[PDB]
Ligand binder design. Structure first.
Ligand SMILES: O=C(NCCCNC(=O)c1cc(-c2n[nH]c3ccc(NC(=O)[C@@H]4CCN(CC(=O)N5CCN(c6ccc(-c7ncccn7)cc6)CC5)C4)cc23)ccn1)OC1CCCCCCC1
Length: 342
């Protein structure tokens, strides 16, 4: 008699019991459950990826990366449940620390004080410093991928779209298709970037900081090129120098074809914000990715002075594919073996 939540079997017993629905997404479904061994409630997510290569790849990145990383501001993996044989394995359950909420839900429902914004932003950047120090790009930072406990400790989650950084192969054509979440996409993704540089993640953090200031997404576009309408609408027209960095003619001529747009001042958009927060926001939401602040610079910014402590902002002990779904199943099976009876 396995437990079932909302019409999905949760085959996680007997260790994990008294399940309750939390939510769902394309990845599968997440529940809370009581862990009878450690005597605490946990989060458990049911993933069913084995029919498609893309879902296999995302599952393997998530598992491999999160098992390698160990950081206070990054969700870990505590346990993985799956069948004892590849043949019988159809689902993978990933057990993780239970959190109270995520920043998406929190922003829908709660005004943050400046002290909360500051502490949240510090933790996002502290976690990101470790990620970037491992030569990894998160590539989908957004409020729903930032988890919060009842004391406002923050953990980054979802490494399914992460990649190893590859700046020498970042260049591409104009309006080239992209997977990561549209409101948090850096302008260069639409122009000339594959999102293989650390600057893509800083842009996303900037968008999250703006969202924390007002409870509303700063660049709520409707489609690939509308996203750029919103960005340019606030930042204003790019400078000559910033255009000279866009060598691709289709992207450059698109930008040249637009009427001049003035910058909207941050302090007019966010009249209640701390002026130091707005100076850091400006540096994160810099059009030219080469001029955009890096994570270690952002941590050292005056806005974060109460928390900044590089000795307590650890890095990874070392830095960190077109395989078919059959071979990816075998690699997920091997990567999850440590959690089986043995
Ligand atoms: O019991 C209670 N209740 C109070 C607590 C209430 N908590 C909440 O409401 C809550 C919790 C959480 C939460 N807590 N812990 C978590 C851990 C993880 C996550 N979410 C993730 O990691 C996401 C989901 C997917 N993942 C990527 C991924 O798996 N991968 C691999 C798969 N991949 C993938 C695979 C397949 C497909 C696919 N498949 C099919 C078709 C298409 N695509 C797509 C992607 C993507 C990357 C990223 C969230 C949380 C978040 C939000 N709200 O009392 C406490 C307990 C009692 C005691 C006292 C304490 C407090 C009170």
């Amino acid at each position: 008699g396995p437990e079932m939540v909302r019409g999905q079997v949760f085959d996680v017993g007997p260790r994990y019991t008294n399940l309750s629905y939390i939510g769902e997404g394309a990845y599968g479904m997440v529940c809370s459950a009581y862990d009878n061994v450690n005597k605490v409630r946990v989060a458990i997510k049911k993933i069913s990826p084995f029919e498609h290569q893309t879902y296999c790849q995302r599952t393997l990145r998530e598992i491999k990366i999160l098992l390698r990383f160990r950081h206070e501001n990054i969700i870990g993996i505590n346990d993985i449940i799956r069948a004892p044989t590849i043949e019988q394995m159809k689902d993978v359950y990933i057990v993780q620390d239970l959190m109270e909420t995520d920043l998406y839900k929190l922003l829908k429902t709660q005004h943050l004080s400046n002290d909360h914004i500051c502490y949240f932003l510090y933790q996002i950047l502290r976690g990101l410093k470790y990620i970037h120090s491992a030569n990894v790009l998160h590539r989908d930072l957004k409020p729903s991928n930032l988890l919060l406990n009842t004391t406002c400790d923050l953990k980054i989650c979802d490494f399914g779209l992460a990649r190893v950084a590859d700046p020498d192969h970042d260049h591409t054509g104009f309006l080239t298709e992209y997977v990561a979440t549209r409101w948090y996409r850096a302008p260069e993704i639409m122009l000339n970037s594959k999102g293989y540089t650390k600057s893509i993640d800083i842009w996303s953090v900037g968008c999250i900081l703006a969202e924390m200031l007002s409870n509303r997404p700063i660049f709520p576009g409707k489609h690939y090129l509308d996203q750029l309408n919103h960005i340019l609408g606030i930042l204003g027209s790019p400078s000559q120098e910033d255009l000279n960095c866009i060598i691709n003619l289709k992207a450059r001529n698109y930008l040249l074809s637009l009427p001049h747009k003035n910058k909207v001042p941050w302090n007019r958009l966010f009249p209640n914000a701390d002026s130091k927060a707005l100076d850091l926001l400006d540096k994160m939401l810099t059009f030219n990715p080469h001029k955009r602040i890096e994570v270690e610079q952002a941590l050292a910014h005056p806005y974060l002075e109460q928390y900044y402590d590089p000795s307590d902002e650890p890095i990874a002990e070392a830095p960190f594919d077109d395989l078919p779904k059959e071979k990816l199943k075998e690699l997920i099976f091997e990567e999850t073996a440590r959690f089986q009876p043995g």
